[PDB]
Predict the structure of Tyrosine--tRNA ligase.
Amino acid sequence: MDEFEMIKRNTSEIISEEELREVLKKDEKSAGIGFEPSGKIHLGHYLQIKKMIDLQNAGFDIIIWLADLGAYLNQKGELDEIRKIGDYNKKVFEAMGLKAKYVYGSEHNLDKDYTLNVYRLALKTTLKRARRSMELIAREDENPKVAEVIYPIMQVNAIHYNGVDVAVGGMEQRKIHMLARELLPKKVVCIHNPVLTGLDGEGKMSSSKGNFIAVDDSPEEIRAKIKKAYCPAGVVEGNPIMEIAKYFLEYPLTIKRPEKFGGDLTVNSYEELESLFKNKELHPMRLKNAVAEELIKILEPIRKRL
Amino acid sequence: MDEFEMIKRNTSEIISEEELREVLKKDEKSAGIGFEPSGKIHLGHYLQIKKMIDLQNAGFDIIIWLADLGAYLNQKGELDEIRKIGDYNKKVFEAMGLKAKYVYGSEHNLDKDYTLNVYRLALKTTLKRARRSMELIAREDENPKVAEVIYPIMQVNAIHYNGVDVAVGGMEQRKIHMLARELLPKKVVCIHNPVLTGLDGEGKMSSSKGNFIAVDDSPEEIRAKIKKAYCPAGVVEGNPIMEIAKYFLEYPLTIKRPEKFGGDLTVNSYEELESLFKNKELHPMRLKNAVAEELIKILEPIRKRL
Ligand SMILES: N[C@@H](CC1=C2C=CCC=CC2=CC1)C(=O)O
Ligand SMILES: N[C@@H](CC1=C2C=CCC=CC2=CC1)C(=O)O
Ligand SMILES: [Ca+2]
């Protein structure tokens, strides 16, 4: 199906494709993703919002859950300062061309009936299971707090509370979402997107450890950031520059180079770019320059609307 | 930038890319291709019309030259019958969605001023050169006729007469088009498309040999013809089914396969299809069936309007 192909494109996994095919037959359907409000919104966020846009075009009503209370339980600061960031994040997400219901957790996460359901789920969730679900999400702490195990069941309940057919997130959301499928009466279809590699080649991209491209970065910031990113010749796996070409660039694409080096390169797909680089037919710096300029031409509509 | 990329896509050569860029700067610009009227219009023809549609979307005015007199000089029968076939070809080309100025050669090829220029060019064209330009075009004849060397002079003059900036044709047209660049006062930009391999892998796709997919073939004939086409596992060069996937199918596309043979296959681009087939991750059967069904869904709007 056309819709199914467009949804699956560039996903790490769908749990399950069979169930997703059933959701697509319905007349009304909805999908939700949530984010701990972040000071800088980077390509990691943009990749996921792109996936939410795909669902919108397939007839899904979209909810964005700004998990300000979740960020609080995960030691990201005080609530009023997280709300300020969440307002900015809502600004950015609309600039990406997503029109969705933007909901703040704290405005719904503390009502009488929501809280009781969290405690019902706490009866259903083992500590071991809750601990393991936060392995990739919990901010480091040498004395892990009780708030760390309340966080995942709150995320399970938002899925229940939102009534969505589809839950979207990064692969690090895998085990929390697997919990929601067991504990909630309705099984939710889970779409997980890949984790972007940081520009310095060490771990994922993230607001902390400045190894990211923000969607509102200036053309000068993007070039410099990409100029010095991790990118060994002939190396595709773990290469953040190739990931950006795979997930954000529009094809066909032209690499201009003098005839002394081969002449201009018309690249009709990402796979053709992968072949050129693997065969050392394209020097890393010419790769970086082209990707940076393309990215600038892709993030420009976002910059203007902000 | 994007216009040039769309024009160059799936061409064998452009003579020259530099000149083509100057053409794109003009407010008005025109392109011409001509066809000896053919009883069966097959994918070989469709490939070329697709390229004319690409030029149209880049701001080119399009001229289709139905070469009834050329087909006459090339031993295709009576002039009266050839013209009728050109009428049918004009319908087919319109059914392909090309809105163009359709011209019949004989309605222009016999005017006194046209003929006099034919003879001007005949002074400038050596016999050996005109004969060489027809190596791949002339119907086989062990007693070659004078009509064989008048044919290329008429095609050279049609370019001049049409006043086009761009001349389009198959790679077998390249010696004639290179002749026109030498003889005419203004160098014309030549865009050459590849020669499709016939379904039996034996040669070009020709109605004359019975190894083609007609754009009005029924789904049965398409399936039957493709089911028994040349398509060895792992062989891309010279494989007509891979060429059809390269030049006609829309990517990304999904190949349906049972889970005992891996499950559904998402193919982001032809280059990925190449890698999969080259490495024998996709069996010829699955390739052939997918190509036949996509092709059926591609030629179907053409089939109805006839
Ligand atoms: N785990 C997500 C943050 C989210 C949440 C946090 C707490 C509670 C409820 C719902 C949530 C939805 C998304 C991340 O890693 O940003
Ligand atoms: N040479 C092309 C057919 C064409 C022509 C043939 C004869 C005369 C004049 C103009 C032509 C324009 C295109 C082919 O090989 O089919
Ligand atoms: Ca602005």
In short: The radius of gyration of chain B is 20 Å. Residues B 34-36, 65, 67, 70, 105, 137, 151, 154-155, 158, 173 surround 96Z (ligand 2) (CB under 6 Å).
